Amino acid sequence: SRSSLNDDLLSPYQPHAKHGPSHSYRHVRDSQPVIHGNRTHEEWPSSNSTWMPVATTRIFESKFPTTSGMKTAYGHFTYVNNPLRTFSVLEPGGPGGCSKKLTATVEETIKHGNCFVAQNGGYFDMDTGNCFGNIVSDGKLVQSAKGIQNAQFGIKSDGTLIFGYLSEEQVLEAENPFVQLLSGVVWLLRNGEVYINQSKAAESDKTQTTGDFDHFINVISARTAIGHDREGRLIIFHVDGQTDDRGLNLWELANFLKDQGVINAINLDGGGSATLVINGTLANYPSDHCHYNPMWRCPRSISTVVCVHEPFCDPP
């Protein structure tokens, strides 16, 4: 059930199946900056504010300097209050989706879920539909990365925001467990600092050529990100573009989020996967072309989804 032609492909690794670095979690800890010691992640309390509304979306059309003048980037910031109760990680098509290797547009996945805001989530194998990385959907472990080291984001049972690199046992921890968790590629910001260089060492093997991953970081394209600010509010970011023509690169994206006050953030699936569905209707410009017409752009059939909804078992 392809909806788009998947022609704006921004792939970090080649081939698509060999996703993530093969080196050990030990090596991530060993090769990260000494200032961090043996902490491969960062924690922050999620906001408990019950103010209305849950999510506030803000539009931007901002200029960025290039060697050939300036460039404009269209996108949105979404600020989420009470992410413990309002933020969820959904499988494609509904519960049990990743095990069937389903791909579905964000519109299709949240069909009945009543998601105020929703964007595409983590990475996936384009040919097979296989989900990539750790996935915890509303308290239930969907799958595990078996120790593969990419940037992670999750919410704990007590409402603690987790960003960074997690070992397998940290993911499968039974005490204060993850209630929401997904995996991206590249740790954008760590404790208010740009963390691109450090992500190269952590999420790409030294045996391989520093070519395919560097292109993933330096090329401009559509991007999505998820982070947080001082107030414990979730940041669900997306910037429209077209790989090697429009958008931002992870260096620009990192500084953009940092300038706006994001402490920690990770890069989620970008390119033609970038999708923003506000209150049921698509609200951004996807970069894939439609299955049916060669000049009309369509959203992509993606994997997991990040959804913001009403609190659960609380106001009513």
Ligand X SMILES: *[C@@H]1O[C@H](CO)[C@@H](O[C@@H]2O[C@H](CO)[C@@H](O)[C@H](O)[C@H]2NC(C)=O)[C@H](O)[C@H]1NC(C)=O
Ligand Y SMILES: *[C@@H]1O[C@H](CO[C@@H]2O[C@@H](C)[C@@H](O)[C@@H](O)[C@@H]2O)[C@@H](O[C@@H]2O[C@H](CO)[C@@H](O)[C@H](O)[C@H]2NC(C)=O)[C@H](O)[C@H]1NC(C)=O
Binding site for its own copies (CB under 8 A): 58-62, 72, 74, 240, 242, 245-246, 278-283, 285-287, 290, 293, 295-298
Closest CB to ligand X among residues 76, 258: 76
Question: Which of 13, 116, 124, 153 lies at the binding interface for ligand X (CB under 6 A)?
Answer: 116
What track of x and - describes contact with ligand X for positions 10 through 49 (by CB under 6 A)?
Answer: ----------------------------------------
Closest CB to K ion among residues 94, 261: 261
Q: Is 310 exposed, middle or buried (0-12, 13-18, 19+ CB in 10 A)?
A: middle
Helix locations, 75-137, DSSP H:
83-86, 97-100, 106-109
Closest CB to its own copies among residues 118, 161: 118
Q: Is 172 exposed, middle or buried (0-12, 13-18, 19+ CB in 10 A)?
A: middle
Cα Rg, the chain, nearest whole Å: 18
CB of 114 to its own copies, least distance (A): 14
The entry of ligand Y, K ion, its own copies, none near residue 286 (CB within 5 to 8 angstroms by kind) is its own copies
Strands across the sheet with 41-45, in order?
Answer: 41-45, 160-164, 152-156, 178-183, 135-137, 140-143
Instruction: Give the CA-trace dihedral at 14, 18, 20, 24, to 10 degrees.
Output: -130
Q: Which two tokens stand for residue 257?
A: 């989020």
Q: Is there binding between residue 192 and K ion (CB under 5 A)?
A: no
CB of 266 to K ion, least distance (A): 15
Residues 42-61 that bind ligand X (CB under 6 A): 52-53, 55, 57
C-beta of residue 116 within 8 angstroms of C-beta of residue 289: no
To 10 degrees, what angle do helices 196-203 and 250-259 make? 130
CB of 140 to its own copies, least distance (A): 30
Helix locations, 145-241, DSSP H:
168-172, 196-203, 212-218
Contacts of 206 by beta carbon, 8 Å cutoff, 6+ apart: 23
Question: Which of 45, 94, 147, 311 lies at the binding interface for K ion (CB under 5 A)?
Answer: 147
C-beta of residue 92 within 8 angstroms of C-beta of residue 303: yes
The entry of its own copies, ligand Y, K ion, none near residue 285 (CB within 5 to 8 angstroms by kind) is its own copies
In 3-state terms the chain splits into helix, strand, coil percentages (rounded to 5) of 15, 35, 50
Q: Is there binding between residue 69 and ligand Y (CB under 6 A)?
A: no
Closest CB to K ion among residues 178, 288: 288
Residues 276-305 that bind ligand Y (CB under 6 A): none
Amino acid in the structure at residue 30: D
**DSSP state letter for 46:** P
Closest CB to ligand X among residues 119, 198: 119
The entry of K ion, ligand X, ligand Y, none near residue 38 (CB within 5 to 8 angstroms by kind) is ligand Y
Closest CB to its own copies among residues 9, 282: 282
Q: Is there binding between residue 56 and K ion (CB under 5 A)?
A: yes
CB of 157 to K ion, least distance (A): 26
Residues 24-43 that bind ligand Y (CB under 6 A): 37-38
CB of 67 to ligand X, least distance (A): 36
C-beta of residue 240 within 8 angstroms of C-beta of residue 284: yes
Closest CB to K ion among residues 7, 158: 7
Binding site for ligand X (CB under 6 A): 52-53, 55, 57, 116-117, 278-279
Binding site for ligand Y (CB under 6 A): 37-38
